[PDB]
């Protein structure tokens, strides 16, 4: 199944009353932050509040990325979730303001389920006998039909090779995709026609297909700008046509959710565009993440501010606290990886690995869980014993023992 | 549309016959030495004597150097081109600095070109159907005239299509080309070198100095001595000259020593500062020692409190409303407290609020209430 | 569920003044700020009249007075308005001079009255002789649509076009550059002289007219000195739209240089700003604007909760107390009740915290 680094996330475990369970979907800890993120996912699912900002204040090494992934998995596939690395902003050819604004347009999306009839082409109905009137038959495996087409489609027909045995896909907006060499063309058992040899296209003539599709506005802007957007003519036209599409009853808007990591490592001009553009009435909700604490804002060289965030940006932002843990549940979290791994472990090796986890950090034990099972597979043991983990604790060193040597 | 700006009351310099002083000289008041120092150099501008000179302006913020920089150009009229350019337009990312500076120098220096031409128009009659003789009739509202033309002109007309009785420019649509049988016209206009450099670049952009110097100066030399082109330079004005990179200072006081260089008036506002690009330099007026030996330093005085009435009266004449005695007294007091720009700034919203409340004049209590509404930058 | 439903401080429609330009205590707009809203009404009347040019108004005060709400009220009560940030003109393909110039010249609008003669319709011939598939007329002098410009109609069209004619004269076609920003530094003589001459000829012929615009530049605490040198000529130019600067910080060192000046500005832009300072909100004003903001998402509160909300919003920031009712409405919805309580807002205050709560608890430094 190709399990990634963390695959514990399958939910967030919120009940109807609004309580937080002790162990739900491998997310043990922080019931206050559990309720604080339940409030904001209810705010996302309520579809009434846009223009908010969430900061996850905590020490480095708590696992707030798993909390954001739990938010994204509770939302699922309906709400578009696009995380942004802080190093995705520093571009060379495109300015950073436009990158942040295009991320804000990646947030906002719509869904306008529709229809589309397929035509699929007969074999040979090249009848230009009028040019306004073209008769094209169809010979599919279900049977034969005919249709009259206005001259165009035919002007797309003579552009491509229309010979004995071709496919003609005709869309609703005169979008013709054509092939060559179908059905049968083996006349005298001769050489290559150098075409595509496809069997019979089983299926009838007239289907009525319905697809629910989520469309982002940035793909719309890319498809409309080409045959840095103007904020007086282009995006206002997009806003007007989306207003017309939702007033006629075609598309349905969904709110935008973003998640930004290493926010404090951005430039101060990105900050003064960020807390100016989140003041708009159309601004999506963006969950910010600050990694380290009190440092210097990039571009100031003297201004001291907490969490690397200026005073104008630190205001009007909700703050959720994520503190450290207690060691007596660390052996539980390793167990959450064990049922993810598929190989059961013993009881004393869990104790030694929990001792190594409470020695320096939990992530060191989580990363050493994999070579323990690897040496258990090499040596032939069905479970992980204490000798393999006590050998891999001495063979592989962390940053503290590397700074000690 | 007049579009009254800040310095819209300034008409000209106002020198009477010798160029010494006047008080109500249809513009800015006071500044006798500055008016003399800018009235000496206009004879050099109009006479085309020297080239590569520089004029330095210095003083506190509020001396009105923009007014004299406009008045030195309005006295010249449309004959001498005036193109101001601050150091912010020199700063750019894609195009470099010296290219924009050379385009500014080409916007300065201009040409005057005359031309005589003969224009023929009217409807035509032909009889010719090529032995040294072409009959061409020409009918206009003044009458008819027959002409004999060369067979090469008739061959060139035979190359295209000729309608029997059309309008042919011999050098349902086009009804009645009114005019006589021949139009001999001599017209003189002006040529900017920036458009010539663009047309050399894009006939339908960093440049090498060979086309810049030689390919222009050779045809200018061949066209002056014939009696067609006349070289007339321009006057440039560079505001905030102390806010420049030191490489720009090296380029400026090299290019002022060239043989082909117009006159440029610098504007230095601030005093000692650190020159950008270098460190630990406390040169006066943001200018190094090399450029100070080339510029003409003009010192501007401070305005007296008596001449504030002469400043505000022409602004009230431009706006078109009278000022009472107590209102003028309070405006003079607040013009002695802070700079005169704050006194000029509170002329329009006072008149607008008096138009709203229904006051045909300006009250001292009215300007007192609008000064209570917002205060100056000094007590921030 | 349409695109803008609620955001930051913009819920009031228009701006609220009177014939004597005095704001009320319970009306449209915000509660309080008599001198600030009075000066905003005076400069908005100056914009509506349009007598002179070069009017730069600076607004200042403590963080939390709502300059954005005043800007949105002046925008809705206003004509092309434009509100830009301090980093939009900072680009890589364009310079810091061309982008600010395009931000200046975009707010200027042109009304164009154009009368054309159009003969349109369906064919009924070919080969030259013109008639229709008419309802009305005949007399020559299949199925396609042909329009001929000089049935017959003299159509009058009003155009509201910005100064992006400078975009279309330098360009070859009108399809490419009319959808994004465009090229690098162009011919400035083509921008100034030919445009001013042709618009002056259009004014003399009486075909088109011009109207100015408003540009709101927020967060001017950080700005390079290139823009400060550009505004010496930009405010002293022949024509320029009105500028509303918003500066939050009092004393800030200018990036690139080393100076100590108020509002991060030099002496040249110091005397060119009509400076309006504000006043922080009192008890009754905060309680009244909370009573206004309770009517946003149709959320009712108990009697003993407004005092607690105002007590939290007085010590902490005001926008935190604005967010508290939104964070408590979901808990009240999950409670299945039509009225919030004291324990609800105390639980929301225990969940979400502010800078004054996180100042003490960050003493670990691990």
């Amino acid at each position: 199944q190709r399990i990634a680094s963390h695959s514990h996330v399958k939910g967030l475990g919120l009940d109807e009353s609004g309580l937080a369970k002790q162990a739900a979907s491998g997310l043990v800890g922080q019931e206050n932050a559990r309720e604080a993120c339940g409030v904001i996912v209810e705010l996302i699912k309520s579809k009434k509040m846009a223009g908010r900002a969430v900061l996850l204040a905590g020490p480095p090494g708590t696992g707030k990325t798993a909390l954001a992934l739990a938010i994204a998995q509770e939302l699922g596939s309906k709400v578009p979730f696009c995380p942004m690395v802080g190093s995705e902003v520093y571009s060379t050819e495109i300015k950073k303001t436009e990158v942040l604004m295009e991320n804000f347009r990646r947030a906002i999306g719509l869904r306008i389920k529709e229809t589309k009839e397929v035509y699929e082409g007969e074999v040979t109905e090249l009848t230009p006998c009028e040019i306004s009137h073209v008769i094209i038959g169809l010979k599919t495996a279900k049977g034969t039909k005919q249709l009259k087409l206005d001259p165009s489609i035919f002007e797309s027909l003579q552009k491509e090779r229309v010979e004995a045995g071709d496919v003609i896909y005709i869309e609703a907006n005169s979008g013709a995709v054509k092939r060559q060499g179908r059905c049968d063309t083996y006349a005298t058992e001769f050489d290559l026609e150098a075409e595509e040899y496809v069997p019979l296209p089983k299926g009838d003539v007239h289907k009525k297909k319905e697809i629910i599709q989520d469309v982002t506005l940035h793909d719309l802007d890319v498809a409309n700008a080409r045959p840095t957007e103007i904020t007086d003519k282009l995006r206002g036209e997009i806003n007007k046509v989306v207003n017309k599409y939702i007033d006629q009853g075609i598309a349905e808007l969904v709110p935008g959710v973003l998640f930004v990591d290493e926010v404090h490592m951005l430039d101060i001009e990105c900050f003064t565009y960020l807390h100016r553009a989140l003041e708009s009435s159309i601004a999506p909700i963006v969950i910010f993440a600050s990694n380290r604490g009190n440092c210097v804002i990039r571009g100031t060289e003297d201004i001291t501010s907490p969490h690397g965030i200026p005073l104008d940006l630190l205001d009007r932002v909700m703050i959720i606290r994520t503190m450290l843990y207690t060691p007596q549940e660390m052996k539980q979290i390793i167990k959450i990886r064990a049922q993810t791994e598929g190989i059961n472990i013993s009881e004393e090796a869990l104790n030694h690995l929990g001792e190594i986890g409470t020695k320096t950090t939990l992530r060191y034990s989580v990363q050493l869980l994999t070579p323990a099972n690897l040496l258990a597979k090499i040596n032939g043991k069905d479970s992980i014993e204490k000798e393999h983990v006590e050998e891999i604790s001495e063979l592989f060193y962390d940053a503290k023992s590397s700074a000690k040597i | 549309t007049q579009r009254i700006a800040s310095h819209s009351h300034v008409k000209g310099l106002g020198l009477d016959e010798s160029g010494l002083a006047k008080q109500a000289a249809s513009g800015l008041v006071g500044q006798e030495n500055a008016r003399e120092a800018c009235g000496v150099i206009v004879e050099l501008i109009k006479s085309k004597k020297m080239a590569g000179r520089a004029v330095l302006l210095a003083g506190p913020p509020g001396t009105g150097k923009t007014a004299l920089a406009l008045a030195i150009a309005q006295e010249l009229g449309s004959k001498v081109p005036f193109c101001p350019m601050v150091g912010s337009e020199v700063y750019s990312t894609e195009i470099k600095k010296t290219e924009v500076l050379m385009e500014n120098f080409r916007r300065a220096i201009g040409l005057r070109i005359k031309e005589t031409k003969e224009v023929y128009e009217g409807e035509v009659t032909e009889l010719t159907p090529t032995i040294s003789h072409v009959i061409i009739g020409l009918k206009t509202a003044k009458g008819t005239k027959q002409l004999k033309l060369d067979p090469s002109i008739f061959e060139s007309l035979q190359k295209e299509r000729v309608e029997a009785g059309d309008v042919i420019y011999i050098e349902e649509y086009v009804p009645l080309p009114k005019g006589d049988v021949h139009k001999k016209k001599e017209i003189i206009q002006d040529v900017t070198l920036h458009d010539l450099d663009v047309a050399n670049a894009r006939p339908q952009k960093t440049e090498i100095t060979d086309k810049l110097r030689g390919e222009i100066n050779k045809v200018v030399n061949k066209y002056i001595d014939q009696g067609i082109a006349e070289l007339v330079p321009g006057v440039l004005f560079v505001d905030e000259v102390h806010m420049l990179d030191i490489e720009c200072f090296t380029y400026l006081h090299r290019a002022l020593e060239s043989s082909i260089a117009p006159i440029v008036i610098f504007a230095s506002n601030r005093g000692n500062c650190v020159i950008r690009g270098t460190e630990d330099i406390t040169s006066p007026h943001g200018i190094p020692l090399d450029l100070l030996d080339r510029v003409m330093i003009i010192r501007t005085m401070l305005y007296t409190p008596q001449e504030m009435k002469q400043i505000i009266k022409i602004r009230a004449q431009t706006e078109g409303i009278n000022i009472s005695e107590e209102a003028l007294n309070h405006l003079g007091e607040i013009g002695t407290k802070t700079t005169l720009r704050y006194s000029v700034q509170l002329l329009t919203p006072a008149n607008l609020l008096a138009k709203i409340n229904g006051k045909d004049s300006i009250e001292k209590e009215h300007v007192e209430e609008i000064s209570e509404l917002f205060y100056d930058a000094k007590s921030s | 569920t349409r695109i803008e439903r609620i955001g930051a401080h913009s819920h009031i429609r228009g701006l609220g003044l009177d014939d004597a330009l005095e704001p009320r205590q319970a009306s449209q707009g915000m509660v309080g700020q008599l001198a600030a809203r009075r000066a905003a009404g005076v400069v908005l009347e100056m914009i509506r009249e349009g007598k002179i040019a070069g009017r730069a108004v600076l607004i200042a005060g403590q963080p939390g007075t709502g300059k954005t709400a005043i800007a949105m009220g002046m925008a809705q009560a206003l004509t092309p308005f434009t509100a830009i940030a301090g980093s939009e003109i900072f680009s890589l393909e364009m310079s810091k001079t061309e982008a600010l110039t395009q931000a200046f010249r975009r707010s200027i609008g042109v009304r164009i009255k154009e009368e054309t003669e159009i003969i349109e319709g369906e064919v009924v011939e070919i080969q030259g002789k013109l008639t229709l598939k008419t309802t009305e007329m005949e007399t020559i002098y299949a199925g396609d649509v042909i329009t001929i410009d000089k049935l017959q109609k003299r159509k009058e069209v009003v155009h509201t076009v910005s100064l992006h004619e400078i975009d279309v004269i330098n360009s070859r076609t009108q399809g490419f550059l009319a959808l994004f920003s465009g090229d690098t530094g162009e011919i400035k003589s083509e921008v100034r002289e030919q445009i001013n001459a042709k618009v002056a000829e259009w004014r003399e012929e009486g075909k088109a007219e011009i109207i100015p615009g408003v540009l709101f530049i927020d967060e001017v605490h950080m700005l390079d000195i290139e823009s400060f040198s550009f505004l010496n000529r930009a405010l002293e130019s022949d024509m320029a739209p009105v500028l509303i600067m918003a500066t939050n910080r009092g004393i800030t060192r200018i990036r690139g240089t080393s100076y100590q000046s108020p509002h991060g500005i030099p002496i040249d832009l110091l005397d060119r700003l009509l400076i309006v300072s504000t006043t922080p909100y009192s008890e009754k004003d905060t309680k009244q604007i909370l009573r206004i903001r309770c009517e946003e998402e149709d959320v009712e509160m108990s009697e003993d909760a407004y005092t607690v909300l105002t007590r939290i919003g007085l010590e902490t920031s005001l926008r935190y107390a604005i967010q508290l009712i939104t964070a408590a409405s979901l808990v009240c919805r999950k409670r299945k009740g039509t009225e919030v309580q004291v324990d609800d807002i105390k639980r929301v205050y225990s969940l979400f915290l502010d800078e004054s709560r996180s100042t003490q608890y960050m003493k670990e430094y691990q």
């Binding site: 003519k233 017309k244 | 070109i113 017209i187 040529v191 050399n200 045809v219 067609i228 | 076009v161």
Partner: peptide
């Protein structure tokens, strides 16, 4: 099918005395 601004947009000293000043005609003399 909307469109914002365009229906169709709008967008004598010369006389043979300046074409000789330019070398940017088809003849590249070198």
């Amino acid at each position: 099918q909307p469109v914002a601004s365009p229906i169709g947009p709008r967008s004598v000293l010369f006389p043979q005395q300046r074409l000789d000043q330019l070398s940017e005609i088809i003849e590249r003399f070198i």
